[PDB]
């Protein structure tokens, strides 16, 4: 009945060959919903059994384009099939900014054969809730970003966590975070994380083999930023075991997991902090929506 | 035989049109020449190919747009910003039909406020969203001379408005030829029946052309729309049949250019089925005497004679 289908797996822009990039179809009450839009959203909603024209909304985390790359294709499509269904797409500050130039990029095309036809666009800031028919929704600022707080690229950035409540369920899908306070009070009690998750040195030692005039100072630099903007497997756990979530759905996964030894690897070390259900998700692993 | 990469053509998505399919990607190629990586065509889930294809975006010289509908370049954003994302560091060019340069702006565009956020840590420094990339506005008749290939872009009859009009002169649809060293490969792009393209194509080593079944197309148009009107349905039927290729054109167009081979791609509805495989090609076979292929998502054909 109610379902996620994690549609891309992949975390990060370096894309994979079994794990597509971040993309995910949450189907509630027969009515289809994006979270997150990486490329490739259109193909893999198809292949999951969905259709492109019952999409009737979108929510972005945050504004990098492993997350947004898909975005232009969704809504361009859309059109050109002259979908019927209105179409909002929440999410962070900017998000207006971006997809008005999904607009300006359809702009000649279109016109060759508006742009913005049946298209509503929403800004979530932390702390906003908004009641939809289908579930309530709740944003909040999270640790991706390290902005200062109170200034002003600590509004105008932001990259957001989502709570979805539905009638009777609610999952929450971290996006992409380091460890955060908020994010661990969002998911107090939930039925099911969602969550990101990152081998550090794994991504690092892969950024320097295709950079392999890197200085010592750049890669030690971007070890330490990223431990600061992602979860590492332990953290997910502390996560998980803090807010006392009922099952956990690892997604955004870098890098790239093709092995059992792998897959045995991160789930023994989650398991070090939280003793529950844990999944390593594929591309088009689809989740009961259901207590 | 598995030693030193080779020259090849990789129908990385061969869905006709802008209704997906499971199993047929959107509208997506890679042609692959003295170790460099183009694209030709850029619909959605274009890097999610190409990777799949052991192939990488960072690689990626030069895209070519044959025109600006949607199933043809609603990748090209992805491809763009994901590059600039790792900071992809060779120049890449994009080239397309008058409109290109507004439709890559645009792009740029999308970029802007997530780039300037960027990866969020105080003391970054701002670059550009348009960073690395050049845009070349082609029509009918130009040749590019690049040291991989010539490139020759024909105005093909995929629309039908009237010469010398303005909208003739601002939208075109391009069916290109690649000349390599040794090999000579021509990309149909969309087009209906076109005298243009049979000449582009003559003698052709290889075809990559698109074909369409226009009843069933139509029949999946109608259900998307199940109170589209009857004359409207009729409308379209007879557009199809001029700004596409039926199964049968197909086999004349290869027949009277004569090409040594024929490759089907952007082919629409997507096939499933052996015994659509079997009538298509046959209907194709009724007219070309030569090498028939009704291609697959990554299957890769060998620029070589
Ligand atoms: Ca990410
Ligand atoms: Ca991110
Ligand atoms: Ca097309
Ligand atoms: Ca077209
Ligand atoms: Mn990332």
Redesign the pocket.
């Known amino acids: 009945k109610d379902e996620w289908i994690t549609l891309g797996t992949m975390?990060?822009p370096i894309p994979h060959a079994t794990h597509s990039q971040?993309s995910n179809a949450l189907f509630v009450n027969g009515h289809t919903y994006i979270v997150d839009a990486g490329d490739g959203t259109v193909g893999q909603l198809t292949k999951a059994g969905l259709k492109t024209t019952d999409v009737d909304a979108v929510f972005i985390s945050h504004l990098?384009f492993?997350?947004t790359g898909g975005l232009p294709a969704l809504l361009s499509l859309r059109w050109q099939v002259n979908a019927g269904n209105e179409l909002t797409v929440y999410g962070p500050p900017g998000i207006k900014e971006t997809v008005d130039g999904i607009f300006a990029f359809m702009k000649y095309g279109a016109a060759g054969h508006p742009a913005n036809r049946k298209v509503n666009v929403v800004e979530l800031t932390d702390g906003d809730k908004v009641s939809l028919e289908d579930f309530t929704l709740t944003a909040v600022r999270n640790t991706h970003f390290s902005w200062p707080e109170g200034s002003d690229e600590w509004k105008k950035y932001q990259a957001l966590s989502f709570k979805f409540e539905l009638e009777d369920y609610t999952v929450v899908y971290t996006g992409?975070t380091g460890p955060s306070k908020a994010v661990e009070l969002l998911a107090k009690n939930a039925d099911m994380l969602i969550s990101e998750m990152m081998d550090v040195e794994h991504t690092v030692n892969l950024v320097k083999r295709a950079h392999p005039h890197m200085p010592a100072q750049a890669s030690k630099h971007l070890s330490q930023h990223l431990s600061t903007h992602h979860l590492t497997s332990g953290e997910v756990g502390q996560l998980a075991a803090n807010a006392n979530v009922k099952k956990v759905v690892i997604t955004?996964m870098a890098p790239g997991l093709t092995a059992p030894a792998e897959y045995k690897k991160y789930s023994n070390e989650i398991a070090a902090f939280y003793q529950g259900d844990i999944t390593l998700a594929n591309d088009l692993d689809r989740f009961l929506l259901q207590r």
Do not use: T
Request: a negative charge; aromatic letters at 0%.
């Open positions: 975390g990060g971040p990098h492993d997350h992409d955004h």
